[PDB]
mmCIF file of C-alpha atoms and ligand atoms in Angstrom:
data_model
loop_
_atom_site.group_PDB
_atom_site.id
_atom_site.type_symbol
_atom_site.label_atom_id
_atom_site.label_comp_id
_atom_site.label_asym_id
_atom_site.label_seq_id
_atom_site.Cartn_x
_atom_site.Cartn_y
_atom_site.Cartn_z
ATOM 1 C CA UNK A 4 3.710 10.536 29.005
ATOM 2 C CA UNK A 5 4.028 7.005 27.255
ATOM 3 C CA UNK A 6 5.032 3.688 29.006
ATOM 4 C CA UNK A 7 8.453 2.153 28.571
ATOM 5 C CA UNK A 8 8.388 0.092 25.404
ATOM 6 C CA UNK A 9 11.316 -1.940 23.997
ATOM 7 C CA UNK A 10 12.015 -1.337 20.238
ATOM 8 C CA UNK A 11 14.535 -3.661 18.361
ATOM 9 C CA UNK A 12 16.626 -2.234 15.446
ATOM 10 C CA UNK A 13 18.357 -4.290 13.264
ATOM 11 C CA UNK A 14 22.148 -4.140 12.438
ATOM 12 C CA UNK A 15 22.431 -1.525 9.739
ATOM 13 C CA UNK A 16 25.718 -0.414 7.781
ATOM 14 C CA UNK A 17 24.355 2.685 6.812
ATOM 15 C CA UNK A 18 23.238 3.755 10.192
ATOM 16 C CA UNK A 19 20.151 3.077 12.217
ATOM 17 C CA UNK A 20 18.554 6.155 10.472
ATOM 18 C CA UNK A 21 17.273 8.349 13.307
ATOM 19 C CA UNK A 22 18.777 11.543 15.135
ATOM 20 C CA UNK A 23 19.653 11.866 18.706
ATOM 21 C CA UNK A 24 19.157 15.496 20.141
ATOM 22 C CA UNK A 25 18.757 16.705 23.862
ATOM 23 C CA UNK A 26 19.838 19.535 26.270
ATOM 24 C CA UNK A 43 17.597 14.510 31.489
ATOM 25 C CA UNK A 44 16.724 12.097 28.449
ATOM 26 C CA UNK A 45 17.947 12.504 25.156
ATOM 27 C CA UNK A 46 15.053 12.434 22.691
ATOM 28 C CA UNK A 47 14.572 11.462 18.877
ATOM 29 C CA UNK A 48 14.279 14.681 16.795
ATOM 30 C CA UNK A 49 13.694 12.998 13.500
ATOM 31 C CA UNK A 50 13.496 9.658 11.631
ATOM 32 C CA UNK A 51 14.405 8.858 8.026
ATOM 33 C CA UNK A 52 11.504 7.523 6.421
ATOM 34 C CA UNK A 53 12.102 3.602 5.649
ATOM 35 C CA UNK A 54 15.309 3.608 7.522
ATOM 36 C CA UNK A 55 16.332 0.686 9.983
ATOM 37 C CA UNK A 56 14.833 2.785 13.174
ATOM 38 C CA UNK A 57 11.480 3.576 11.180
ATOM 39 C CA UNK A 58 10.816 0.100 10.561
ATOM 40 C CA UNK A 59 11.249 -1.098 14.150
ATOM 41 C CA UNK A 60 8.736 1.433 15.797
ATOM 42 C CA UNK A 61 10.820 4.411 16.630
ATOM 43 C CA UNK A 62 8.979 7.599 16.377
ATOM 44 C CA UNK A 63 9.752 11.118 16.558
ATOM 45 C CA UNK A 64 9.718 12.414 20.279
ATOM 46 C CA UNK A 65 10.888 9.276 21.516
ATOM 47 C CA UNK A 66 12.835 9.848 25.056
ATOM 48 C CA UNK A 67 15.893 7.365 25.060
ATOM 49 C CA UNK A 68 15.483 5.616 28.671
ATOM 50 C CA UNK A 69 17.940 2.620 27.946
ATOM 51 C CA UNK A 70 20.482 1.602 25.450
ATOM 52 C CA UNK A 71 21.204 -2.124 24.732
ATOM 53 C CA UNK A 72 19.878 -2.719 28.222
ATOM 54 C CA UNK A 73 21.896 0.183 30.188
ATOM 55 C CA UNK A 74 20.117 3.186 31.672
ATOM 56 C CA UNK A 75 21.096 6.400 30.308
ATOM 57 C CA UNK A 76 19.376 8.526 32.699
ATOM 58 C CA UNK A 77 21.642 11.585 33.370
ATOM 59 C CA UNK A 78 24.144 10.748 30.576
ATOM 60 C CA UNK A 79 25.396 13.262 28.291
ATOM 61 C CA UNK A 80 24.264 13.704 24.666
ATOM 62 C CA UNK A 81 27.581 12.256 23.353
ATOM 63 C CA UNK A 82 27.633 9.532 25.583
ATOM 64 C CA UNK A 83 24.147 8.347 24.430
ATOM 65 C CA UNK A 84 25.450 8.483 20.832
ATOM 66 C CA UNK A 85 28.945 6.783 21.700
ATOM 67 C CA UNK A 86 26.892 3.978 23.428
ATOM 68 C CA UNK A 87 24.404 3.615 20.549
ATOM 69 C CA UNK A 88 27.462 3.571 17.946
ATOM 70 C CA UNK A 89 29.546 1.267 20.118
ATOM 71 C CA UNK A 90 28.383 -2.489 19.152
ATOM 72 C CA UNK A 91 27.842 -1.834 15.488
ATOM 73 C CA UNK A 92 25.297 -4.613 15.481
ATOM 74 C CA UNK A 93 21.465 -4.417 16.451
ATOM 75 C CA UNK A 94 20.225 -1.686 18.715
ATOM 76 C CA UNK A 95 17.807 -2.597 21.357
ATOM 77 C CA UNK A 96 16.250 0.719 22.746
ATOM 78 C CA UNK A 97 13.965 1.279 25.710
ATOM 79 C CA UNK A 98 11.935 4.426 24.812
ATOM 80 C CA UNK A 99 9.268 6.675 26.452
ATOM 81 C CA UNK A 100 7.015 7.883 23.517
ATOM 82 C CA UNK A 101 4.630 10.816 23.157
ATOM 83 C CA UNK A 102 1.547 8.620 23.520
ATOM 84 C CA UNK A 103 0.018 8.213 19.904
ATOM 85 C CA UNK A 108 -3.158 3.418 11.063
ATOM 86 C CA UNK A 109 -3.206 -0.405 9.526
ATOM 87 C CA UNK A 110 -5.918 -1.320 12.136
ATOM 88 C CA UNK A 111 -7.986 -3.118 9.338
ATOM 89 C CA UNK A 112 -5.103 -5.015 7.700
ATOM 90 C CA UNK A 113 -4.670 -8.582 7.740
ATOM 91 C CA UNK A 114 -0.892 -9.143 8.114
ATOM 92 C CA UNK A 115 0.064 -7.645 11.423
ATOM 93 C CA UNK A 116 3.753 -7.207 12.811
ATOM 94 C CA UNK A 117 5.249 -10.547 14.281
ATOM 95 C CA UNK A 118 5.792 -10.507 17.992
ATOM 96 C CA UNK A 119 9.239 -11.806 19.016
ATOM 97 C CA UNK A 120 10.538 -10.688 15.723
ATOM 98 C CA UNK A 121 14.349 -11.265 14.998
ATOM 99 C CA UNK A 122 15.463 -10.337 11.737
ATOM 100 C CA UNK A 123 18.784 -12.059 11.856
ATOM 101 C CA UNK A 124 17.198 -15.403 12.889
ATOM 102 C CA UNK A 125 14.599 -15.099 9.926
ATOM 103 C CA UNK A 126 17.278 -14.322 7.434
ATOM 104 C CA UNK A 127 19.371 -17.216 8.637
ATOM 105 C CA UNK A 128 16.158 -19.520 8.268
ATOM 106 C CA UNK A 129 15.506 -18.153 5.102
ATOM 107 C CA UNK A 130 18.959 -18.870 3.802
ATOM 108 C CA UNK A 131 18.545 -22.485 4.925
ATOM 109 C CA UNK A 132 15.540 -22.813 3.293
ATOM 110 C CA UNK A 133 16.840 -21.623 0.031
ATOM 111 C CA UNK A 134 20.014 -23.656 0.386
ATOM 112 C CA UNK A 135 17.752 -26.791 1.117
ATOM 113 C CA UNK A 136 17.935 -29.407 -1.385
ATOM 114 C CA UNK A 137 15.204 -28.557 -3.828
ATOM 115 C CA UNK A 138 14.133 -25.272 -2.268
ATOM 116 C CA UNK A 139 11.938 -25.219 0.905
ATOM 117 C CA UNK A 140 9.558 -22.885 -0.367
ATOM 118 C CA UNK A 141 7.144 -23.881 2.646
ATOM 119 C CA UNK A 142 9.528 -22.404 5.261
ATOM 120 C CA UNK A 143 9.901 -19.366 2.890
ATOM 121 C CA UNK A 144 6.278 -18.630 2.718
ATOM 122 C CA UNK A 145 5.412 -19.240 6.460
ATOM 123 C CA UNK A 146 8.004 -16.888 7.226
ATOM 124 C CA UNK A 147 7.584 -13.963 4.911
ATOM 125 C CA UNK A 148 3.686 -13.982 4.573
ATOM 126 C CA UNK A 149 3.840 -13.719 8.683
ATOM 127 C CA UNK A 150 5.898 -10.839 8.937
ATOM 128 C CA UNK A 151 4.789 -6.939 8.497
ATOM 129 C CA UNK A 152 6.377 -5.486 5.255
ATOM 130 C CA UNK A 153 8.787 -3.200 7.405
ATOM 131 C CA UNK A 154 9.746 -6.433 9.076
ATOM 132 C CA UNK A 155 10.658 -8.155 5.550
ATOM 133 C CA UNK A 156 12.923 -5.180 4.885
ATOM 134 C CA UNK A 157 14.868 -5.404 7.868
ATOM 135 C CA UNK A 158 15.356 -9.394 6.821
ATOM 136 C CA UNK A 159 16.386 -8.346 3.538
ATOM 137 C CA UNK A 160 19.031 -5.991 5.002
ATOM 138 C CA UNK A 161 20.347 -8.681 7.539
ATOM 139 C CA UNK A 162 20.056 -11.326 4.463
ATOM 140 C CA UNK A 163 22.320 -9.321 2.226
ATOM 141 C CA UNK A 164 24.750 -8.487 5.070
ATOM 142 C CA UNK A 165 25.163 -12.109 5.823
ATOM 143 C CA UNK A 166 25.160 -13.677 2.249
ATOM 144 C CA UNK A 167 26.260 -10.789 0.208
ATOM 145 C CA UNK A 168 23.635 -11.478 -2.095
ATOM 146 C CA UNK A 169 20.349 -9.511 -2.386
ATOM 147 C CA UNK A 170 17.401 -11.468 -0.863
ATOM 148 C CA UNK A 171 15.118 -10.432 -3.793
ATOM 149 C CA UNK A 172 17.684 -12.000 -6.437
ATOM 150 C CA UNK A 173 18.248 -15.045 -4.209
ATOM 151 C CA UNK A 174 14.474 -15.606 -4.115
ATOM 152 C CA UNK A 175 14.079 -14.947 -7.883
ATOM 153 C CA UNK A 176 16.460 -17.591 -8.858
ATOM 154 C CA UNK A 177 15.162 -20.177 -6.046
ATOM 155 C CA UNK A 178 11.083 -19.715 -6.825
ATOM 156 C CA UNK A 179 9.113 -19.739 -10.029
ATOM 157 C CA UNK A 180 5.676 -19.567 -11.329
ATOM 158 C CA UNK A 181 3.029 -17.268 -9.335
ATOM 159 C CA UNK A 182 4.683 -17.974 -6.018
ATOM 160 C CA UNK A 183 7.752 -16.144 -7.337
ATOM 161 C CA UNK A 184 5.341 -12.993 -8.054
ATOM 162 C CA UNK A 185 3.849 -13.156 -4.741
ATOM 163 C CA UNK A 186 7.292 -13.107 -2.532
ATOM 164 C CA UNK A 187 8.764 -10.592 -4.802
ATOM 165 C CA UNK A 188 5.838 -8.205 -4.347
ATOM 166 C CA UNK A 189 5.980 -8.620 -0.948
ATOM 167 C CA UNK A 190 9.581 -7.867 -0.565
ATOM 168 C CA UNK A 191 9.063 -4.335 -2.253
ATOM 169 C CA UNK A 192 7.642 -1.442 0.072
ATOM 170 C CA UNK A 193 4.202 -0.161 -0.799
ATOM 171 C CA UNK A 194 5.327 2.461 -3.048
ATOM 172 C CA UNK A 195 7.907 0.244 -4.891
ATOM 173 C CA UNK A 196 5.439 -2.366 -5.506
ATOM 174 C CA UNK A 197 3.014 0.076 -6.707
ATOM 175 C CA UNK A 198 5.439 2.001 -9.016
ATOM 176 C CA UNK A 199 6.901 -1.295 -10.405
ATOM 177 C CA UNK A 200 3.353 -2.490 -11.156
ATOM 178 C CA UNK A 201 2.648 0.960 -12.998
ATOM 179 C CA UNK A 202 5.483 0.483 -15.061
ATOM 180 C CA UNK A 203 4.929 -3.097 -15.903
ATOM 181 C CA UNK A 204 1.366 -2.042 -16.788
ATOM 182 C CA UNK A 205 2.631 0.587 -19.269
ATOM 183 C CA UNK A 206 5.754 -0.877 -20.564
ATOM 184 C CA UNK A 207 5.583 -2.885 -23.998
ATOM 185 C CA UNK A 208 3.035 -2.593 -26.952
ATOM 186 C CA UNK A 209 -0.191 -1.177 -25.770
ATOM 187 C CA UNK A 210 -0.967 -0.928 -21.935
ATOM 188 C CA UNK A 211 -2.623 -2.823 -19.181
ATOM 189 C CA UNK A 212 -5.278 -0.361 -18.814
ATOM 190 C CA UNK A 213 -7.020 -2.369 -15.970
ATOM 191 C CA UNK A 214 -3.729 -2.508 -13.916
ATOM 192 C CA UNK A 215 -3.178 1.188 -14.458
ATOM 193 C CA UNK A 216 -6.745 2.208 -13.440
ATOM 194 C CA UNK A 217 -6.738 -0.040 -10.515
ATOM 195 C CA UNK A 218 -3.881 1.369 -8.761
ATOM 196 C CA UNK A 219 -4.548 5.158 -10.151
ATOM 197 C CA UNK A 220 -8.217 5.039 -8.960
ATOM 198 C CA UNK A 221 -7.814 3.375 -5.539
ATOM 199 C CA UNK A 222 -4.729 5.152 -4.057
ATOM 200 C CA UNK A 223 -4.743 8.323 -1.816
ATOM 201 C CA UNK A 224 -3.063 11.442 -2.019
ATOM 202 C CA UNK A 225 -0.409 10.504 0.365
ATOM 203 C CA UNK A 226 0.333 7.284 -1.341
ATOM 204 C CA UNK A 227 0.192 8.711 -4.934
ATOM 205 C CA UNK A 228 2.768 11.266 -3.346
ATOM 206 C CA UNK A 229 5.125 8.642 -2.328
ATOM 207 C CA UNK A 230 4.484 6.678 -5.653
ATOM 208 C CA UNK A 231 5.481 9.633 -7.664
ATOM 209 C CA UNK A 232 8.666 10.070 -5.853
ATOM 210 C CA UNK A 233 9.620 6.630 -5.650
ATOM 211 C CA UNK A 234 8.622 6.005 -9.648
ATOM 212 C CA UNK A 235 10.906 9.047 -10.476
ATOM 213 C CA UNK A 236 13.882 7.318 -8.220
ATOM 214 C CA UNK A 237 13.543 3.905 -9.535
ATOM 215 C CA UNK A 238 13.060 4.776 -13.373
ATOM 216 C CA UNK A 239 14.627 8.274 -13.599
ATOM 217 C CA UNK A 240 11.492 9.670 -15.237
ATOM 218 C CA UNK A 241 8.003 11.237 -14.172
ATOM 219 C CA UNK A 242 5.162 8.832 -13.900
ATOM 220 C CA UNK A 243 3.050 11.447 -15.182
ATOM 221 C CA UNK A 244 5.609 11.373 -18.236
ATOM 222 C CA UNK A 245 5.057 7.543 -18.893
ATOM 223 C CA UNK A 246 1.157 7.850 -18.438
ATOM 224 C CA UNK A 247 1.208 10.717 -21.328
ATOM 225 C CA UNK A 248 3.228 8.022 -23.515
ATOM 226 C CA UNK A 249 0.953 5.373 -23.186
ATOM 227 C CA UNK A 250 -2.606 6.970 -23.142
ATOM 228 C CA UNK A 251 -4.547 9.300 -24.746
ATOM 229 C CA UNK A 252 -8.015 11.157 -25.291
ATOM 230 C CA UNK A 253 -9.906 12.125 -22.123
ATOM 231 C CA UNK A 254 -8.949 8.716 -20.601
ATOM 232 C CA UNK A 255 -5.283 10.159 -20.560
ATOM 233 C CA UNK A 256 -6.708 13.600 -18.916
ATOM 234 C CA UNK A 257 -8.627 11.430 -15.957
ATOM 235 C CA UNK A 258 -5.410 9.622 -15.312
ATOM 236 C CA UNK A 259 -3.025 12.233 -15.328
ATOM 237 C CA UNK A 260 -5.246 14.340 -13.098
ATOM 238 C CA UNK A 261 -5.854 11.308 -10.619
ATOM 239 C CA UNK A 262 -2.171 10.454 -10.602
ATOM 240 C CA UNK A 263 -1.143 13.862 -9.132
ATOM 241 C CA UNK A 264 -2.586 12.942 -5.871
ATOM 242 C CA UNK A 265 -3.760 16.650 -5.249
ATOM 243 C CA UNK A 266 -7.246 15.952 -4.261
ATOM 244 C CA UNK A 267 -8.864 18.216 -1.705
ATOM 245 C CA UNK A 268 -8.326 17.159 1.767
ATOM 246 C CA UNK A 269 -11.054 15.880 3.848
ATOM 247 C CA UNK A 270 -12.377 19.166 5.465
ATOM 248 C CA UNK A 271 -14.194 19.817 8.993
ATOM 249 C CA UNK A 272 -17.183 21.804 7.018
ATOM 250 C CA UNK A 273 -19.472 20.076 4.851
ATOM 251 C CA UNK A 274 -20.422 22.191 1.845
ATOM 252 C CA UNK A 275 -23.792 21.472 1.518
ATOM 253 C CA UNK A 276 -24.192 24.345 -1.133
ATOM 254 C CA UNK A 277 -21.371 22.882 -3.093
ATOM 255 C CA UNK A 278 -22.674 19.249 -2.779
ATOM 256 C CA UNK A 279 -25.642 20.406 -4.731
ATOM 257 C CA UNK A 280 -24.194 22.441 -7.289
ATOM 258 C CA UNK A 281 -21.584 19.554 -8.120
ATOM 259 C CA UNK A 282 -24.609 17.286 -8.269
ATOM 260 C CA UNK A 283 -26.243 19.505 -11.028
ATOM 261 C CA UNK A 284 -23.061 19.876 -12.920
ATOM 262 C CA UNK A 285 -22.719 16.093 -12.955
ATOM 263 C CA UNK A 286 -26.197 15.733 -14.256
ATOM 264 C CA UNK A 287 -26.245 18.847 -16.874
ATOM 265 C CA UNK A 288 -22.732 17.296 -18.185
ATOM 266 C CA UNK A 289 -24.344 14.099 -18.802
ATOM 267 C CA UNK A 290 -27.648 12.368 -18.665
ATOM 268 C CA UNK A 291 -29.604 15.587 -18.986
ATOM 269 C CA UNK A 292 -27.975 16.431 -22.555
ATOM 270 C CA UNK A 293 -26.986 14.780 -25.572
ATOM 271 C CA UNK A 294 -23.186 13.338 -25.324
ATOM 272 C CA UNK A 295 -21.102 14.035 -22.292
ATOM 273 C CA UNK A 296 -19.053 17.157 -20.972
ATOM 274 C CA UNK A 297 -16.073 14.827 -19.944
ATOM 275 C CA UNK A 298 -13.891 17.373 -18.741
ATOM 276 C CA UNK A 299 -16.592 18.378 -16.054
ATOM 277 C CA UNK A 300 -16.910 14.767 -15.022
ATOM 278 C CA UNK A 301 -13.195 14.880 -14.454
ATOM 279 C CA UNK A 302 -12.812 18.090 -12.457
ATOM 280 C CA UNK A 303 -15.255 17.350 -10.048
ATOM 281 C CA UNK A 304 -14.252 13.706 -9.462
ATOM 282 C CA UNK A 305 -10.656 14.513 -9.167
ATOM 283 C CA UNK A 306 -10.863 17.520 -7.267
ATOM 284 C CA UNK A 307 -13.324 17.273 -4.444
ATOM 285 C CA UNK A 308 -12.431 15.314 -1.148
ATOM 286 C CA UNK A 309 -13.912 11.747 -0.953
ATOM 287 C CA UNK A 310 -16.405 12.688 1.867
ATOM 288 C CA UNK A 311 -17.667 15.462 -0.413
ATOM 289 C CA UNK A 312 -18.043 13.283 -3.435
ATOM 290 C CA UNK A 313 -20.036 10.677 -1.641
ATOM 291 C CA UNK A 314 -22.496 12.913 -0.547
ATOM 292 C CA UNK A 315 -22.492 14.551 -4.060
ATOM 293 C CA UNK A 316 -23.361 10.921 -5.441
ATOM 294 C CA UNK A 317 -26.202 10.750 -3.252
ATOM 295 C CA UNK A 318 -27.713 14.339 -4.123
ATOM 296 C CA UNK A 319 -27.136 13.223 -7.616
ATOM 297 C CA UNK A 320 -29.785 10.452 -7.527
ATOM 298 C CA UNK A 321 -32.206 13.671 -6.554
ATOM 299 C CA UNK A 322 -31.858 15.107 -10.101
ATOM 300 C CA UNK A 323 -30.818 11.930 -12.364
ATOM 301 C CA UNK A 324 -33.115 8.920 -12.788
ATOM 302 C CA UNK A 325 -29.937 6.939 -12.550
ATOM 303 C CA UNK A 326 -27.137 6.510 -10.133
ATOM 304 C CA UNK A 327 -23.626 7.710 -10.829
ATOM 305 C CA UNK A 328 -22.441 4.074 -11.827
ATOM 306 C CA UNK A 329 -25.370 3.446 -14.315
ATOM 307 C CA UNK A 330 -25.107 7.024 -15.488
ATOM 308 C CA UNK A 331 -21.386 6.443 -16.552
ATOM 309 C CA UNK A 332 -22.400 2.893 -18.378
ATOM 310 C CA UNK A 333 -24.797 5.099 -20.440
ATOM 311 C CA UNK A 334 -22.637 7.951 -21.302
ATOM 312 C CA UNK A 335 -18.992 6.801 -21.720
ATOM 313 C CA UNK A 336 -17.418 3.743 -23.258
ATOM 314 C CA UNK A 337 -14.260 1.646 -23.282
ATOM 315 C CA UNK A 338 -11.371 2.905 -20.853
ATOM 316 C CA UNK A 339 -12.854 5.946 -19.965
ATOM 317 C CA UNK A 340 -15.766 3.779 -18.863
ATOM 318 C CA UNK A 341 -13.683 1.594 -17.050
ATOM 319 C CA UNK A 342 -11.850 4.466 -15.292
ATOM 320 C CA UNK A 343 -15.002 6.124 -13.984
ATOM 321 C CA UNK A 344 -16.494 3.033 -12.974
ATOM 322 C CA UNK A 345 -13.560 2.222 -10.938
ATOM 323 C CA UNK A 346 -13.169 5.675 -9.354
ATOM 324 C CA UNK A 347 -16.618 5.790 -8.399
ATOM 325 C CA UNK A 348 -16.559 2.495 -6.675
ATOM 326 C CA UNK A 349 -13.293 3.511 -4.874
ATOM 327 C CA UNK A 350 -15.005 6.661 -3.574
ATOM 328 C CA UNK A 351 -18.269 4.875 -2.655
ATOM 329 C CA UNK A 352 -16.820 1.828 -1.018
ATOM 330 C CA UNK A 353 -13.228 0.888 -1.572
ATOM 331 C CA UNK A 354 -13.074 -2.585 0.654
ATOM 332 C CA UNK A 355 -16.251 -3.509 -1.567
ATOM 333 C CA UNK A 356 -14.558 -2.424 -4.957
ATOM 334 C CA UNK A 357 -11.490 -4.646 -4.004
ATOM 335 C CA UNK A 358 -13.828 -7.473 -3.121
ATOM 336 C CA UNK A 359 -15.312 -7.259 -6.669
ATOM 337 C CA UNK A 360 -12.214 -7.320 -8.279
ATOM 338 C CA UNK A 361 -11.059 -10.324 -6.426
ATOM 339 C CA UNK A 362 -14.240 -12.208 -7.152
ATOM 340 C CA UNK A 363 -14.054 -11.307 -10.711
ATOM 341 C CA UNK A 364 -10.377 -12.615 -10.969
ATOM 342 C CA UNK A 365 -11.478 -15.938 -9.767
ATOM 343 C CA UNK A 366 -15.203 -16.571 -10.566
ATOM 344 C CA UNK A 367 -14.664 -17.646 -14.075
ATOM 345 C CA UNK A 368 -12.320 -20.080 -16.051
ATOM 346 C CA UNK A 369 -8.620 -19.995 -14.668
ATOM 347 C CA UNK A 370 -7.413 -17.053 -12.571
ATOM 348 C CA UNK A 371 -6.550 -13.556 -13.294
ATOM 349 C CA UNK A 372 -3.513 -14.195 -11.201
ATOM 350 C CA UNK A 373 -1.917 -10.740 -11.537
ATOM 351 C CA UNK A 374 -4.742 -8.965 -10.294
ATOM 352 C CA UNK A 375 -5.459 -11.497 -7.374
ATOM 353 C CA UNK A 376 -1.756 -11.250 -6.295
ATOM 354 C CA UNK A 377 -1.640 -7.582 -6.331
ATOM 355 C CA UNK A 378 -4.715 -6.786 -4.474
ATOM 356 C CA UNK A 379 -3.414 -9.493 -1.722
ATOM 357 C CA UNK A 380 -0.102 -8.040 -1.460
ATOM 358 C CA UNK A 381 -1.100 -4.454 -1.314
ATOM 359 C CA UNK A 382 -4.051 -4.410 0.820
ATOM 360 C CA UNK A 383 -2.755 -6.933 3.301
ATOM 361 C CA UNK A 384 -1.696 -4.426 5.746
ATOM 362 C CA UNK A 385 -4.579 -1.491 4.760
ATOM 363 C CA UNK A 386 -8.242 -2.953 4.652
ATOM 364 C CA UNK A 387 -8.160 -6.632 4.058
ATOM 365 C CA UNK A 388 -10.302 -7.096 7.079
ATOM 366 C CA UNK A 389 -13.001 -4.771 5.479
ATOM 367 C CA UNK A 390 -12.183 -6.587 2.264
ATOM 368 C CA UNK A 391 -13.174 -9.916 3.463
ATOM 369 C CA UNK A 392 -16.447 -8.561 5.462
ATOM 370 C CA UNK A 393 -17.633 -7.181 2.307
ATOM 371 C CA UNK A 394 -16.965 -10.373 0.224
ATOM 372 C CA UNK A 395 -18.351 -12.670 2.702
ATOM 373 C CA UNK A 396 -21.559 -10.630 2.970
ATOM 374 C CA UNK A 397 -21.980 -10.177 -0.837
ATOM 375 C CA UNK A 398 -20.909 -13.748 -2.088
ATOM 376 C CA UNK A 399 -22.120 -15.887 0.792
ATOM 377 C CA UNK A 400 -18.667 -17.505 1.468
ATOM 378 C CA UNK A 401 -15.333 -16.256 2.518
ATOM 379 C CA UNK A 402 -12.593 -14.902 0.215
ATOM 380 C CA UNK A 403 -10.500 -17.631 2.022
ATOM 381 C CA UNK A 404 -12.741 -20.130 0.357
ATOM 382 C CA UNK A 405 -12.355 -18.687 -3.135
ATOM 383 C CA UNK A 406 -8.732 -18.771 -3.001
ATOM 384 C CA UNK A 407 -8.514 -22.035 -1.909
ATOM 385 C CA UNK A 408 -10.760 -23.225 -4.886
ATOM 386 C CA UNK A 409 -8.872 -21.328 -7.602
ATOM 387 C CA UNK A 410 -5.069 -21.716 -6.524
ATOM 388 C CA UNK A 411 -2.862 -24.644 -5.417
ATOM 389 C CA UNK A 412 0.469 -25.390 -3.931
ATOM 390 C CA UNK A 413 2.657 -23.054 -2.003
ATOM 391 C CA UNK A 414 1.264 -19.994 -3.988
ATOM 392 C CA UNK A 415 -1.998 -20.985 -2.801
ATOM 393 C CA UNK A 416 -0.803 -21.023 1.238
ATOM 394 C CA UNK A 417 0.991 -17.462 0.791
ATOM 395 C CA UNK A 418 -2.538 -15.973 -0.771
ATOM 396 C CA UNK A 419 -4.460 -17.731 2.301
ATOM 397 C CA UNK A 420 -1.831 -16.108 4.847
ATOM 398 C CA UNK A 421 -2.256 -12.871 3.128
ATOM 399 C CA UNK A 422 -5.780 -13.011 3.588
ATOM 400 C CA UNK A 423 -5.555 -13.753 7.254
ATOM 401 C CA UNK A 424 -8.125 -16.415 8.085
ATOM 402 C CA UNK A 425 -11.740 -17.731 7.077
ATOM 403 C CA UNK A 426 -14.840 -15.351 7.066
ATOM 404 C CA UNK B 9 21.090 21.911 21.539
ATOM 405 C CA UNK B 10 23.334 19.132 20.463
ATOM 406 C CA UNK B 11 22.179 16.979 17.668
ATOM 407 C CA UNK B 12 23.607 13.908 15.791
ATOM 408 C CA UNK B 13 22.470 11.445 13.419
ATOM 409 C CA UNK B 14 23.162 7.590 14.266
HETATM 410 CA CA1 CA C 501 11.039 -27.336 -3.513
HETATM 411 CA CA1 CA C 502 12.440 -17.845 -11.156
HETATM 412 CA CA1 CA C 503 3.444 0.667 -24.481
HETATM 413 CA CA1 CA C 504 -25.671 12.309 -22.459
HETATM 414 CA CA1 CA C 505 -11.356 -19.565 -11.510
#
C-alpha cells in the first residue's frame, strides 16, 4: 500500500517533470528520467495525498494540477507509493536536504575572499548525485551563472577535477571520460578499457544515448577512429551493451561447451582464435561466464587470467584481463586499480578520481571490503598517504570512512 | 482519463 512519505522537489523553470493522471487520489503516471521530480524521489504509481501541505483528497484533476502549478517555487508532495539499488554505495542522500540552502551556501563559499574550498567540499561530497543536480539548477536560477562554470573558475588542480566530475550525472561523467580518453593523438587505452569493461548493459545504454547528445556522434564511431585490430573489435562489442541478461535457468551444457571453446581457441592450440574469445566473453551473461571460467579450469592447466597472459599481449591483453576481472569480482577489480594508482611514486590521479566518483553510489562499500581484506589497511589510509589538502578530503568523503 | 504534465 505504501506509507505517507514527503518528497521535496526543487523549483524548476522547465517544470517539475512528472505526469499527473487520475479518474479518489490522482497518481503519477510517468516521470522524466533525470527531471526534478525523478531526483527528489518521486516514482511511478505514487498517489498524491498532499500538495504543499494541503490535503487534496476528493479534488478534481484540474485542481491538483492547479495547486501544483500555483506557487512556481518548490513542490513539497506527500505521496503514497506502490511499496518498492545503490545499497552498497558510500555516498547516501543527505537527509534534511535543501537545494536553495546549499546553492546559497556554495555561492557564499565561492564569493568568500580566497574561495572557501572547504565548505564546497563539505557540501558536494556529502550529497547524492541527484541532489547535486538540484543544487546546480537552484544555483543557476539565483546567480544566472552555471555552477560547473563557476566552480571551474574558483577551483584548480586535482580538486577541480573531482568537483567537476561529481557535478555530472553518471552517464555524462562516463561519456566525457570516454571522449577525453580518445581525443588527441593516440588514446588513453587504460581509461577506455576501464569504463567499457566495467559498465553494465543499462549503464552503457544510457552512456551511448548521452554521448550522442553531448558530442553529436555515436560513441562506437569514435572507438573505431581511435582503435584497431582485435582490440577495436572487443571494445566495439562491449560498448554496444547488448550482453545477454541474467537468466533464470543455468545452462550447464552451454557452460561446458563455452569452456571447451575457450580452451580449444587458446591454450590447446598454437596461436589464438581471438574472435572466439570475444564472442563468448561479450555475449554471455555475467553469471554464466563466472561458471564458464570455473569449468574452464577443468580443461586448462591455467585459469582464465593466466591463459590471457600467455596467449595475447598489448592492449588486447589489458582489455581481456580487465574484462575477466570485472566478470569475476568487480569490487575487487576496482580495489586493485585503486591500489595500483597509489602504490608507487606519485599518484595516477585520473584513475583514482574517476573510480572514487563513479563508484561512490554503486559499490564503494564492497570495494573497501575487498581492499582492506587484500591489503591489510583501508582504502581511506592509502588515500590519506597519497593525497593532501582539500583534494584529499573530498576523496575521503567519497570513500565514506575508515575500513 | 485526464492527464497533464507538470
Ligand atoms: Ca582558498
Ligand atoms: Ca580552474
Ligand atoms: Ca586520437
Ligand atoms: Ca595458444
Ligand atoms: Ca603513491
